[PDB]
RNA sequence: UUGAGUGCAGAAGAGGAGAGUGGAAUUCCAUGUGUAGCGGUGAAAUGCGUAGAUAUAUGGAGGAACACCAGUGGCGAAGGCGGCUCUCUGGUCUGUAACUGACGCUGAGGCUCGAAAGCGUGGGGAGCAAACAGGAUUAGAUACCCUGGUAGUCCACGCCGUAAACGAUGAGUGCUAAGUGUUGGAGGGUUUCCGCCCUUCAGUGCUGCAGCAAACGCAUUAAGCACUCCGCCUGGGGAGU
RNA sequence: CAUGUCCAGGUUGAAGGUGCGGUAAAACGCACUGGAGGACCGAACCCACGUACGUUGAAAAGUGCGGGGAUGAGGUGUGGG
RNA sequence: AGUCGGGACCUAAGCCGAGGCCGAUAGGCGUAGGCGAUGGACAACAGGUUGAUAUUCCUGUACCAGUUGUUUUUGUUUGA
RNA sequence: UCUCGUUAAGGAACUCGGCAAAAUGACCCCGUAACUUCGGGAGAAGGGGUGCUGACUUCGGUCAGCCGCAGUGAAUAGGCCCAAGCGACUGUUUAUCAAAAACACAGGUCUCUGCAAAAUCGUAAGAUGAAGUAUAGGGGCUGACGCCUGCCCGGUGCUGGA
């Protein structure tokens, strides 16, 4: 559920977090963890990129499977976990063999289940299928993009995707966004939408906290010297001279769309409809 | 709830003689069992608003075959209640 | 052991919650045909249309309500419940007369439920429609009439606690002429009765005698005759302020 | 950015748990335990709000006396962009 | 100074980068491999001595890794 | 002139402004209002005791007695109350004339972006966004919380059109 602090002092007025009421154990597998950085932002030049990184706690990274390859062995989930990386917990799996990795945690999974991936499994939570033996109307992610890259399409909590109808190439499927299209039919995909499903509802409280995840404040426009932002300036507080007000080095931002009009998929999208 | 199997197999572990369907024992043995079905039911859905009134009624029904109970003695009274395990 | 309750044997039902599913219709979309109108009114206008409309045919999408059966029929304590199927689940009625032995009734404070409109959080959005816009009638029309249209109407979990929430008729129980239909039963004769006739239990309507009523009318479903327990009233305004 | 390091002493009592009581089971009340916090008072440390002097100054930004924060959006050392 | 801090050990941020991929020249970036303590890992203690040095000189008691000499088990298969 | 100590009677009449000084300050005990987001205001206010000797100490303290003008006898150690504006708060800011009503800030809302994602550094390879994938990532305005958030699309942009 949802924690409510009894508000005692005025930072910590009406904060929220989790209960953590799922997540079994606190101790990450070993051979599974892999070192990492805090960019704050920059290149191998030594700029800032994009605004607003670095500064915060310490991550160590988890290598999460992806592909969902090994078939025809049984796969038995132990424990969930707490995942600092992306917004969704993962799950540790032993097979049969004596080898282990992670997946991605359903809406739904439990210890004590077991898992196959097969191109002729049955259709439960869990279970990693090709795109084509995959009947219509169901719930799928982890979907990929190219076969054999892994999943990069929906990947995060409390996400959807149907499956509108098959073709005889390709697929079609409602993305989340919803905004249809199509993929190859020979790629991999698991059922059930993602885990923590109020990880939307969390007000943090604090500015100290969303400084605890790596964030950093970011000054408005208008307040900068006309030299440095294309806002400011103006004694007083000012209303936005130019029109369509802008970011700080053009493109306005309100209205104006920004695919890339030469694209080479806009023969296998229909209805963008929610950007 | 129950059914007859059960229904009538306590008959018979709190019967007083062979026959013993009145006998305020027993009766209130019967309601104990089925307010516990009850409560399950309603645990599972709990906005079936016209079953908790049915409840409510065998509660009451219980409460006063167990009044009447005492007032024509004690030690059946308390026995059974030791026996059954309730009365905060 | 007559009231109450339990056992045993049977009966009906849009009683409730959860999970899926069906066709018809309106609308948007795709395509073929197709030519100048469609729609609206007491009369007209606003409007959509030659960026091919209305019409018409094929398929797709989406949300909502369930045509006929439908009945002064059914169920529920009241608010109320009508497409179909499944899992959980309450209540009522007739028969028998195993069993306990008055365990009953009502019920201030308390707790529960509680149409529609309304609020919060997250979804969903086909029709319809407060606000609003335009068109008309009118001395004037911020209204009735017409063309559009937002919240809302739906779903989950919370909140509020009100109606002409009505039969304007508190609840328990017993007694006092008839006739007439209808839903569900149990018995008896005729019997192919499963198609009649007779007796009885339970609801449900119309007419009507005593009695009552200031008249209007009510009358075994009393507003008659009587006991028990609760609620409420005491001239109209000021004001449910 | 990576790797270490520092914060005398004292106070307040959220969540949770346990035990009683109340109920058909429950909201719920009372105790004991429990130790959350950009929580509180205050030295080291970090700052720089008022004032007086100093203003060819002891000093090319201080001093005296007062002041704020002090487990955090903390202070700093070494090697780095 | 065998014993303490560093080298004849390991790596973090970062840097250099055989081949290599780009670029008017200059050069830019990067694989393999390396370099890099603020970190890891590792064998000595007490007392005395001078004008100045002292886990270094001296006394006493130890420890690490090796080399030679008399001092105790043989198919390189591998029961060595 | 600077750094200190003391003062009769009056006690803010000085002054732009009680700036500066003066006054309170420790431990234990009694007691404590409006208001409210129910946590607080609260150390609110306003009061009392403290030394030494003996006796009893159940245990803490209670009794009796002694001295001084003064018993945490020196140094260390909150002045308080009644109303209004601004800003919600803890923070941050012009090294060296301004520390605020300025910026940050949690929440709100619009908008872009289907992954070789948009965006940015670079001529390019290469990078960051990210070992992330719409409950995610950038951009613009507003700034806890409560009640709310009316009218106009003619003009200028943006999106769609053929």
Same mark, same amino acid.
């Given at each position: 559920?949802?924690?409510?602090?009894?508000?005692?002092?005025?930072?910590?007025?009406?904060?929220?977090?989790?209960?953590?009421?799922?997540?079994?154990?606190?101790?990450?597998?070993?051979?599974?963890?892999?070192? +990492?950085?805090?960019?704050?932002?920059?290149?191998?030049?030594?700029?800032?990129?994009?605004?607003?990184?670095?500064?915060?706690?310490?991550?160590?990274?988890?290598?999460?499977?992806?592909?969902?390859?090994?078939?025809?062995?049984?796969?038995?989930?132990?424990?969930?976990?707490?995942?600092?990386?992306?917004?969704?917990?993962?799950?540790?799996?032993?097979?049969?063999?004596?080898?282990?990795?992670?997946?991605?945690?359903?809406?739904?999974?439990?210890?004590?289940? #077991?898992?196959?991936?097969?191109?002729?499994?049955?259709?439960?939570?869990?279970?990693?299928?090709?795109?084509?033996?995959?009947?219509?109307?169901?719930?799928?992610?982890?979907?990929?993009?190219?076969?054999?890259?892994?999943?990069?399409?929906?990947?995060?909590?409390?996400?959807?995707?149907?499956?509108?109808?098959?073709?005889?190439?390709?697929?079609?499927?409602?993305?989340?966004?919803?905004?249809?299209?199509?993929?190859?039919?020979?790629?991999?995909?698991?059922?059930?939408?993602?885990?923590?499903?109020?990880?939307?509802?969390?007000?943090?409280?604090?500015?100290?906290?969303?400084?605890?995840?790596?964030?950093?404040?970011?000054?408005?426009?208008?307040?900068?010297?006309?030299?440095?932002?294309?806002?400011?300036?103006?004694?007083?507080?000012?209303?936005?001279?130019?029109?369509?007000?802008?970011?700080?080095?053009?493109?306005?931002?309100?209205?104006?769309?920004? #695919?890339?009009?030469?694209?080479?998929?806009?023969?296998?999208?229909?209805?963008?409809?929610?950007? | 709830?129950?059914?007859?199997?059960?229904?009538?197999?306590?008959?018979?572990?709190?019967?007083?003689?062979?026959?013993?369907?009145?006998?305020?024992?027993?009766?209130?043995?019967?309601?104990?069992?089925?307010?516990?079905?009850?409560?399950?039911?309603?645990?599972?859905?709990?906005?079936?608003?016209?079953?908790?009134?049915?409840?409510?009624?065998?509660?009451?029904?219980?409460?006063? +075959?167990?009044?009447? +109970?005492?007032?024509?003695?004690?030690?059946?009274?308390?026995?059974?209640?030791?026996?059954?395990?309730? #009365? #905060?």
């Amino acid at each position: 559920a949802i924690k409510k602090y009894k508000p005692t002092t005025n930072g910590r007025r009406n904060m929220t977090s989790s209960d953590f009421a799922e997540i079994t154990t606190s101790t990450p597998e070993k051979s599974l963890l892999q070192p +990492l950085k805090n960019n704050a932002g920059r290149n191998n030049n030594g700029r800032i990129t994009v605004r607003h990184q670095g500064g915060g706690h310490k991550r160590q990274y988890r290598v999460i499977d992806f592909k969902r390859n090994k078939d025809n062995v049984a796969a038995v989930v132990k424990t969930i976990e707490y995942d600092p990386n992306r917004s969704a917990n993962i799950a540790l799996v032993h097979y049969e063999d004596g080898v282990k990795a992670y997946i991605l945690a359903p809406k739904g999974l439990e210890v004590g289940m #077991r898992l196959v991936s097969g191109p002729e499994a049955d259709i439960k939570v869990g279970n990693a299928l090709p795109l084509e033996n995959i009947p219509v109307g169901t719930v799928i992610h982890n979907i990929e993009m190219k076969p054999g890259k892994g999943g990069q399409l929906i990947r995060s909590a409390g996400t959807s995707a149907q499956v509108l109808g098959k073709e005889g190439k390709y697929v079609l499927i409602r993305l989340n966004s919803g905004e249809v299209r199509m993929i190859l039919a020979t790629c991999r995909a698991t059922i059930g939408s993602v885990g923590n499903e109020q990880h939307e509802l969390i007000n943090i409280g604090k500015a100290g906290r969303s400084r605890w995840m790596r964030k950093r404040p970011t000054v408005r426009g208008s307040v900068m010297n006309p030299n440095d932002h294309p806002h400011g300036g103006g004694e007083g507080k000012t209303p936005i001279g130019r029109k369509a007000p802008v970011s700080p080095w053009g493109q306005p931002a309100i209205g104006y769309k920004t #695919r890339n009009k030469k694209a080479k998929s806009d023969k296998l999208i229909v209805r963008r409809r929610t950007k | 709830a129950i059914s007859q199997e059960r229904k009538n197999e306590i008959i018979k572990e709190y019967a007083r003689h062979e026959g013993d369907t009145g006998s305020p024992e027993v009766q209130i043995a019967v309601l104990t069992e089925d307010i516990n079905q009850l409560n399950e039911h309603a645990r599972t859905h709990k906005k079936d608003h016209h079953s908790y009134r049915g409840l409510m009624k065998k509660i009451g029904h219980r409460r006063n +075959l167990l009044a009447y +109970l005492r007032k024509t003695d004690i030690q059946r009274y308390r026995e059974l209640i030791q026996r059954l395990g309730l #009365r #905060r």
